[PDB]
Structure formats: structure tokens, C-alpha cells
Amino acid sequence: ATKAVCVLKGDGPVQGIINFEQKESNGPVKVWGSIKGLTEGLHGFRVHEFGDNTAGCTSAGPHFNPLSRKHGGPKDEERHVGDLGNVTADKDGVADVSIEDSVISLSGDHCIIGRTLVVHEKADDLGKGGNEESTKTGNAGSRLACGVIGIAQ
Amino acid sequence: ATKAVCVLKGDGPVQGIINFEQKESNGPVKVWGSIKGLTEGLHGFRVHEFGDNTAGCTSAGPHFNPLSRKHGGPKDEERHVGDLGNVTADKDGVADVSIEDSVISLSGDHCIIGRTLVVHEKADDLGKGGNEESTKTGNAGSRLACGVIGIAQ
């Protein structure tokens, strides 16, 4: 029963705390928490390859894709392990997060610990935007805030 | 040949970037970089158990000592896995770091990825301070800055 947490920060007002819990080695991971300072609406929510913040959220690099596949949505078969979809911010700029995902993991080949969680400026195409970028980054736009995913108590 | 990195931040002016590199699974780990905003002198440098920054450096928890040994020094036989000794800040408050350690690791049982790196207010007396604290926390003082250790490119 591993747990993990992530504090999200950026140059702007976007900030939040996300928690992860995976009660079983091969079970689903529950991720919940909230993010504030967001514009009302949908925002891309992904895990990027590197837990490197030497240069802001940019150093986090590309989507976490352990097995080179095209970009897609959380429910898709053809996706990136790191694609968690979108989080939704209400009129007050606050996004309450509660997701359950069984592709990402807190251990094994899909372990996201030590990697970066990012919330993007724009909603995630889920690869259905109809252009190059879509199938690549879902056109989520700039990285608003991020943090390294650490082992929690 | 895994690599890792950590951006150190706190409530004060202390901040820096540390890099880790372990070219071989069972080999030593090189850690280097620099920290600024430090008072001139020795400052404890340790890896703590949790990559949890929900409550500043406090949430990082206890030393990373998966082996229940008494506090030791970097070169001391019995030391915590997480005890990296001290880093030294020059008159300008800058500490240049270059260490090589073979107890911590970027993989396996001593894997420090996902955990927190902290630089302390006081020098780590390496368990040689003469009291009961020395052998617990080398009498290192408050946590000046920290960051979660992430996987680097």
C-alpha cells in the first residue's frame, strides 16, 4: 500500500496538492486533491518523464511514455502512461480532483514516483484536436504548475 | 546509468540545484552542484525519508535510515543511508558541492529517488558532538531548504 504526494507550483497563481494511493501492487492508483488559481474550465493533467525542475516546468520534459505510443486520453488504449486527462476548474478557479487510474503505478515499469505532475494551460485534445500537436501533446498549451512526485507517509 | 536531480528551496534565501549520477547499478553515486544563501561554514546535508513537501521541509520526515543504525558520518561505518555529511559555504554564502557516496543509490533498497534532500541550518557533528543529539541528528538544526529528488534526463 504505497502512497505518494505532489505539491504543484509555477510562476503564476496556480497551485495545489495531489495525493496518490495504490493499495495493491497491480491495483489502481487513486489520485485526489485540489488545485487553485486556474481559469474556469478544462486543464490538461499529465505526468511528465523527468522530476527535473531546474528550469521550471519545462525541464520535466515529455509525457511519460514507457513504451512509445501516440498521445491520447486516459480511457484510450492508444495513450501515454502519463496522460491523466483533464481536471476541471469551477468558476472560482478551483479544481477538485478525484481520479482513479490503472495505467500509472507507484511501482514497477509504470512507476511515476520521481517524475513530474503538470497541470496545463489548456484542455487536453485527448489527441482529437485534428493536427500535429494534438496527437503529440493534446495541445494542452503552457505548463501552469508542477511538482515532483514524492513518496508519502 | 541513472541520473537524478533536486531543486532546493525553503522559506528563506537558501536555494540550489544538486545532481546525482550513478553509472552502475552497484557503483558509487556522484552528487554535485551548488547551494547559495547559506551562512559561511558547515551545513548538514541529508536525505530524508519522504518526498513530501506538503508542509515545507518538515514533512520530509526523519533521516532516511532503512537500516536502524545510529547517526554516523559519510565515511563512518555505522551511519544512516541518508547522512551525506556536510556541505561548506564560503564567505559569500555559496557552497560548491562535489561528493561521491557509495551508500545511497539511485536504485534498489537504498534508492533515494522520490525522497527529499535537505540542507540544514547547522553542521552535522557526525555523531561526534558529545551528547545524545549528536548520535540522533548530528545536532544539525532547522531545515533551511529541500526538494524532492527526481529522475533526470
Of A85, A77, A73, nearest to A127 (Cα)?
Answer: A73
Contact (CB<8Å) A54/B17 = yes
Residues of B in contact with A53 (CB under 8 A): 5, 7, 147, 150
Q: Distance (Å, rounded) from C-alpha B38 to C-alpha B104? A: 24
Our CA-based measurement puts residue A72 at a distance from the nearest CA of chain B, in whole angstroms, of 24
Optimal mutation site among A17, A59, A117, A148, interface B, most CBs of chain B within 10 A: A148
Nine-digit cell at B43?
A: 551545513
Kindly state the greatest CA–CA separation across chain B. Answer: 43
Q: What resolution in angstroms does the PDB record give?
A: 2.5
Single-letter amino acid, residue A107: S
Query: What CATH architecture does domain A1-153 belong to?
Result: Sandwich (2.60)
- Technique used: X-ray
CB contact under 8 A, A61 and B153: yes
Query: Is residue A104 within 8 Å of A35, Cβ to Cβ?
Result: no
Domain residue extents for chain B: 1-153
Interchain CB distance below 8 Å, A4 and B50: no
Burial category of B64 from C-beta neighbours within 10 Å (exposed 0-12, middle 13-18, buried 19 and up): buried
- Residue A80 to residues A31, A138, B34, B59: CA-CA distances in angstroms? 17, 11, 35, 31
Q: Would you say the C-alpha torsion B89, B95, B99, B105 has a positive or negative sign? A: positive
Q: Please state the separation of Cα A34 from the chain's center in Å.
A: 13
